[PDB]
Write a protein that binds this DNA or RNA. Structure first.
Ligand SMILES: [Mg+2]
Ligand SMILES: [Mg+2]
Ligand SMILES: [Mg+2]
Ligand SMILES: [Mg+2]
Ligand SMILES: [Mg+2]
Ligand SMILES: [Mg+2]
Ligand SMILES: [Mg+2]
Lengths: 248, 118, 226, 68, 57
RNA sequence: GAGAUGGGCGAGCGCCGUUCCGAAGGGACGGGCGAUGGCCUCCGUUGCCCUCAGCCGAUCGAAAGGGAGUCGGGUUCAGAU
RNA sequence: UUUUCACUGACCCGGUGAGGCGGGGGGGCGAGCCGGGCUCUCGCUUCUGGCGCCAAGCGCCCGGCCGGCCGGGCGCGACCCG
């Protein structure tokens, strides 16, 4: 047969992301002495919308504590932050919306966005529009804390990693239905070439393991095992269960 | 000495200057683009005659490696005249024509008479 | 004093005023060769060095080393210009004894040791393959000749007129130096030759880092308290 | 001669002394690059018996080959 | 004018005679002056109150 | 978007890679030191020391993108900002 | 021989212009104990869309001209060992 499109996606010839008009990578502040021990404050200057990402971004200006300069950083904007606000980053910054401080100091039940998965990583978790994470419990020994991720999984992280306080701005974006293929086209044009999805059953057998036949039917179980070679691993990938959910 | 920056840069060392124990080449090459070899012959067409009579210019055909400064100096050397400005173009044949206008107190008719074109 | 003159103190609190240019030599990103030549020493501290190599760390003390060098200064091999002068002098005398001298070189020293013609042996401690001389102390002990470890193959090679020498040996000395040599030999034999059992069974290395030992100390102190 | 002693040392690669030496040297050469010039042969006896001499015009290059 | 035309122009035509002249509007200039003065005054107040509390304790 | 050096891989021609495992700056406000020319005045060309100093990575990539500055009249057989 | 627990030094991951890491001293705040000592804590920035670098000051040396005038160096400020 022939190489299927899901298998062609790996080389990234025409499937690479469109990143010319993006405004930068949204990252937390780097770890240093000032925020490790005390705190520093930065001014919020602009709140920008970058292409391809639902959540807006904030441009925060800090001053270098080691030389005469001003360091500009791009954050994930939390709800309620306004331009000209003061945001404080550090170990002993008070707990209120906007500020970033380690999860080991906030009381349990705190709502957290742009969580940092490992110390120093500068923010990896709960950074999509309207998402957040919640501190569950602390372990004073071994320096670990338990958090609940937006997918519902509970994960244990080191308490020495920073995290923004609040919930990511731009919630409820999925509420509005795309009414037309035009809106869908404009949505995915700013992300990558993946939108007009063509069904496998509509294809030819040389092109897909489902294509062919005088009737449009899959012809074989849709659940494929996890250890199937690329070019065969299509359908429902190693499904524990299938069908309509009934209950939890 | 104490360090104030957390980076290490390569220290600047003494770079001694070339002194060759023998010249690479035996003798300096001869300038093959001199005044005689830079100008080939003057055009003697009706357009050239009209130009020399009207615009007080002299029309020459030079080689492709000559620039306006060299052309001006070569004309000054060969014909003992002053040059105002030079226009140049490369003909479709491959030769590079030159339009040489003279200072207002020289006469292009007299220069053409002495050079030998008329 | 002018009342205008007045101190303007600088407050280097967190996030208040720009930090001064203090010493940063402990946090510099050193080049790869420096990093390698320091981490090699760190690993030499870390790993359990076998006694065959650890024996070179226990070295002669400074006063005895100075006496050994000042005694050996009387027997440095002659220079090339001195040999040229001797050649001219001998030609002049012919047309008109071999004094004792240090024997340098690992092969010369080892053959003298196994033939029993060396009254003591001096060994360097930092030969960059240690295996050039790692066998030597056992050989010298078995043959009976005294041997010592001297800090610095460079200073050892200063005695000869060469950049570096691994080992040198005294084959014979003079009447005015017999007593000094004998005293030095007996001191060296007491320190090195007679201690060879615990030298041979003395393992090295196996020491942790300062932060590691500090936290272990904190843990054990807490345990001893409760 | 010390060369024979060095020969039997390098024949007894399995002892603890040589295990320490090979461990340390392998770590160091691994930190170094894959093609560099050694100022001196690491095994003078072996290089000499292979044909090396301490003259001018002889050089030693220590290089690394990916295994398998 | 275009950015490379400003080479030809003179400083008087390029700026205005004031602090931050030709770089910041007069409204924000005066707001900045007032902000600076008031922040310094409240810093003095906070310092004196803190020192008085420390002396009392 | 293409593409060297470092690095890695490769039997090999070579390939990956574009800041990633590099000691990646040959510059300068200024001071001193030593030599030189110009009425050695004062300055300039200077070699060294003292001091100051980040580049997002060499380089290529648009005759429709960015990019200071020419217009009027006349003139040929065929050229005109 | 194996199971678990523990360590770090090979090996791996992340951040930085590799900028304050681990100990000890020093200082403040209480608490408990008789001006003294022990355990514990902290060390300077949270009303405001402002500014912040290229050391003030102190102590000790030396240079030049005539105690007066001009111009340099070192340490503290910015604790010590790893
Ligand atoms: Mg498409
Ligand atoms: Mg079909
Ligand atoms: Mg098939
Ligand atoms: Mg104006
Ligand atoms: Mg390439
Ligand atoms: Mg163009
Ligand atoms: Mg254009």
């Amino acid at each position: 047969g022939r190489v299927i499109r899901g298998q062609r996606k790996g080389a990234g010839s025409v499937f690479r992301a469109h990143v010319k008009h993006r405004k930068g990578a949204a990252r937390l502040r780097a770890v240093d002495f000032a925020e490790r021990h005390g705190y520093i404050k930065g001014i919020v200057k602009d709140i920008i919308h970058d292409p391809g990402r639902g959540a807006p971004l904030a441009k925060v200006v800090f001053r270098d504590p080691y030389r005469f300069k001003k360091r500009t950083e791009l954050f994930i904007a939390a709800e309620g932050i306004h331009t000209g606000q003061f945001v404080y980053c550090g170990k002993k910054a008070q707990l209120n919306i906007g500020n970033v401080l380690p999860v080991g100091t906030m009381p349990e039940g705190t709502i957290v966005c742009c969580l940092e998965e490992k110390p120093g990583d500068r923010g990896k978790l709960a950074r999509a529009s309207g998402n957040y994470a919640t501190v569950i419990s602390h372990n004073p020994e071994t320096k670990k804390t338990r958090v609940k991720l937006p997918s519902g999984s509970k994960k244990v992280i080191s308490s020495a990693n920073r995290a923004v306080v609040g919930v990511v701005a731009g919630g409820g974006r999925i509420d509005k239905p795309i009414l037309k293929a035009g809106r869908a086209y404009h949505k995915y044009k700013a992300k990558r070439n993946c939108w007009p999805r063509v069904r496998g059953v509509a294809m030819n057998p040389v092109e897909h393991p489902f294509g062919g036949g005088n009737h449009q039917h899959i012809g074989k179980p849709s659940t494929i095992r996890r250890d199937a070679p690329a070019g065969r691993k299509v359908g429902l990938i190693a499904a524990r269960r299938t069908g309509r959910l009934r209950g939890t | 000495k104490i360090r104030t920056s957390p980076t290490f840069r390569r220290p600047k060392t003494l770079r001694l200057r070339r002194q060759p124990k023998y010249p690479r080449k035996s003798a300096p090459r001869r300038n093959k683009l001199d005044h005689y070899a830079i100008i080939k012959f003057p055009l003697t067409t009706e357009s050239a005659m009209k130009k020399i009579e009207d615009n007080n210019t002299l029309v020459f055909i030079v080689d492709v490696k000559a620039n306006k400064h060299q052309i001006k100096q070569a004309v000054k050397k060969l014909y003992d005249i002053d040059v105002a400005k030079v226009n140049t173009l490369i003909r479709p044949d491959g030769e590079k024509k030159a339009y040489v206008r003279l200072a207002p107190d020289y006469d292009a008719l007299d220069v053409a008479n002495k050079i030998g074109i008329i | 004093v002018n009342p205008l003159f007045e101190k303007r103190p600088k407050n280097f609190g967190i996030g208040q005023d720009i930090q001064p240019k203090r010493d940063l030599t402990r946090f510099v990103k050193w080049p790869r060769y420096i990093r390698l030549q320091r981490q090699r020493a760190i690993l030499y501290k870390r790993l359990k060095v076998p006694p065959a190599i650890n024996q070179f760390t226990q070295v002669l003390d400074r006063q005895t080393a100075t006496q050994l060098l000042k005694l050996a200064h009387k027997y440095r091999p002659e220079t090339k210009q001195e040999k040229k002068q001797r050649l001219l002098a001998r030609a002049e005398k012919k047309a008109a004894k071999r004094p004792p001298v240090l024997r340098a070189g690992v092969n010369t020293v080892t053959t003298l040791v196994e033939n029993k013609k060396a009254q003591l042996v001096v060994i360097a401690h930092d030969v960059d393959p240690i295996e050039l001389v790692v066998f030597l102390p056992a050989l010298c002990r078995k043959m009976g000749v005294p041997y010592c470890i001297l800090k610095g193959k460079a200073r050892l090679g200063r005695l000869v007129h060469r950049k570096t020498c691994t080992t040198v040996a005294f084959t014979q000395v003079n009447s005015e130096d017999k007593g000094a040599l004998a005293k030095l030999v007996e001191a060296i034999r007491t320190n090195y030759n007679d201690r060879y059992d615990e030298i041979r069974r003395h393992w090295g290395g196996n020491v942790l880092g300062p932060k590691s030992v500090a936290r272990i100390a904190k843990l054990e102190k807490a345990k001893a308290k409760e | 001669g010390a060369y024979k002693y060095i020969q039997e040392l390098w024949r007894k690669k399995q002892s603890d002394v040589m295990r320490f030496l090979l461990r340390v040297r392998c770590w160091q050469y691994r930190q170094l690059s894959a093609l560099h010039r050694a100022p001196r042969p690491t095994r003078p006896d072996k290089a000499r018996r292979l044909g090396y001499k301490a003259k001018q015009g002889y050089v030693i290059y220590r290089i690394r080959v990916r295994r398998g | 004018v275009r950015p490379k035309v400003l080479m030809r122009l003179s400083k008087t035509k390029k700026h205005v005679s004031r602090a931050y002249g030709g770089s910041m509007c007069a409204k924000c200039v005066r707001d900045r002056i007032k902000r600076a003065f008031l922040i310094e005054e409240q810093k003095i107040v906070v310092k004196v109150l803190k020192a008085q509390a420390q002396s009392q304790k």
